[PDB]
């Protein structure tokens, strides 16, 4: 019960088409974060720079998602969605859309959110159901990715289980206008769920890459998604690196910018792990180098200021 | 004399233990490491780095995780002299970078 060429080309068109749609969507939300956040909304409180910053972060996660779909295609060259790891990654791509519709069921902030991600995720859901019925009928890199797994899944478990935090009232701050002494809006809960969904998609992407390249089947194909896994991440940080310039406050809230900076810096650090190629025995060699240097320092200190090595050690021949 | 002969033939292991092993390779190294770590202020150059150099110079071999010396040094020195502070250091300097504060 292998995969005949018909199923192969069908899954190829499926993955390539939805991944190209994801890439076009990523470019579109990129230029959205470029000009304005209310491009995708209708609520009045979308005149805020942090909305456009999170918009750019969902654009980077959509870049990652288009990369995930194109590497689905890249694995679809050798008909390689029958390995149990690929099956689990298809199941996690299903749970991605499932928890996305769950998060919008907990609250939906934009009709454009509905349109966009229902299009993508329900397409993915029908696709993954059919391909599951098809398949059923037959070093510091690891630490990096598994830590990104843990951190992103905890960000999800703390972001999709709580309704919302509360912004401090700042007692006596212009009791009239200036949005002070108010509640958080229905224009940011959906923003939080979109951030959480992007964090989950990149979490499942990292889990897939980790349990795939654990042999570090394709050892070199991920070089494509390598791009998607790192560049945007760094770009992510760039957004947050301009966040204090825009004056957006990231220190007060917990479930929004924590995993933001965490996963962004971790993506830059994976760029490092691929940049200098720590052998997992080279940092141990640096440990040994500094230990040998300090040993040579203390031996000199001893023989000079404490007790002469010619005195302490026994001499022979007489 | 006959009793001493029979008793010497049945207790060779215990004899070698008490004459060669009890102090030199069981009690003295324990005492020496605990004594050194009782003195010697709670830094890293004194609690871990110089102990290793002096232990390799004295015993003539480096303490690896295969030996009891490495584990005694690790536990006493590291865990009870530098860890209760480097823990706060990492909890205030490196964990903010990652997701959870």
């Amino acid at each position: 019960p292998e995969l005949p060429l018909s199923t192969n080309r069908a899954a190829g068109t499926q993955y390539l088409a939805i991944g190209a749609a994801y890439a076009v969507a990523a470019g579109a939300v990129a230029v959205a974060a470029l000009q304005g956040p209310q491009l995708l909304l209708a609520s009045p409180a979308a005149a805020d720079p942090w909305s456009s910053v999170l918009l750019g972060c969902v654009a980077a996660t959509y870049l990652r998602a288009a990369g995930v779909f194109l590497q689905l295609k890249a694995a679809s060259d050798a008909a390689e969605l029958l390995c149990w790891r690929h099956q689990r990654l298809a199941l996690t791509a299903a749970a991605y859309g499932m928890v996305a519709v769950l998060t919008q069921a907990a609250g939906l902030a934009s009709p454009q959110l509905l349109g966009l991600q229902l299009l993508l995720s329900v397409a993915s859901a029908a696709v993954v159901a059919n391909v599951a019925r098809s398949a059923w009928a037959v070093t510091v890199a690891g630490l990096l990715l598994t830590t990104t797994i843990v951190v992103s899944l905890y960000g999800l478990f703390a972001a999709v289980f709580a309704p919302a935090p509360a912004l401090p009232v700042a007692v006596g701050a212009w009791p009239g206008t200036a949005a002070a002494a108010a509640v958080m809006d229905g224009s940011a809960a959906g923003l939080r769920r979109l951030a959480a969904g992007g964090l989950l998609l990149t979490a499942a992407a990292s889990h897939g890459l980790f349990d795939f390249a654990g042999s570090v089947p394709n050892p070199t194909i991920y070089s494509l998604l390598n791009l998607g896994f790192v560049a945007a991440a760094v770009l992510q940080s760039y957004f947050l690196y301009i966040a204090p310039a825009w004056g957006v406050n990231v220190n007060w809230d917990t479930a929004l910018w924590g995993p933001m900076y965490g996963t962004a810096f971790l993506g830059l650090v994976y760029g490092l792990v691929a940049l200098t190629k720590f052998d997992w025995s080279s940092v141990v060699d640096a440990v040994l180098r500094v230990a040998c240097w300090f040993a040579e320092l203390t031996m000199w200190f001893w023989d000079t200021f404490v007790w002469k090595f010619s005195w302490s050690e026994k001499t022979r021949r007489a | 004399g006959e009793r001493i002969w029979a008793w010497r033939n049945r207790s060779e292991n215990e004899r070698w233990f008490w004459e060669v092993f009890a102090w030199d390779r069981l009690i003295f190294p324990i005492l020496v490491i605990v004594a050194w770590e009782y003195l010697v202020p709670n830094h890293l150059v004194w609690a871990v780095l110089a102990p290793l150099a002096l232990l390799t110079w004295m015993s003539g071999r480096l303490p690896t995780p295969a030996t009891p010396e490495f584990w005694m040094l690790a536990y006493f020195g590291f865990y009870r002299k530098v860890w209760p502070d480097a823990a706060a250091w990492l909890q205030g300097y490196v964990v903010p970078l990652m997701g959870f504060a």
Partner: peptide, 18 residues
Amino acid sequence: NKIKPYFEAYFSLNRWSV
């Protein structure tokens, strides 16, 4: 540098007792 060989071997007995 009496001690150095013990690390160089890694990064790259009173016979009267028996």
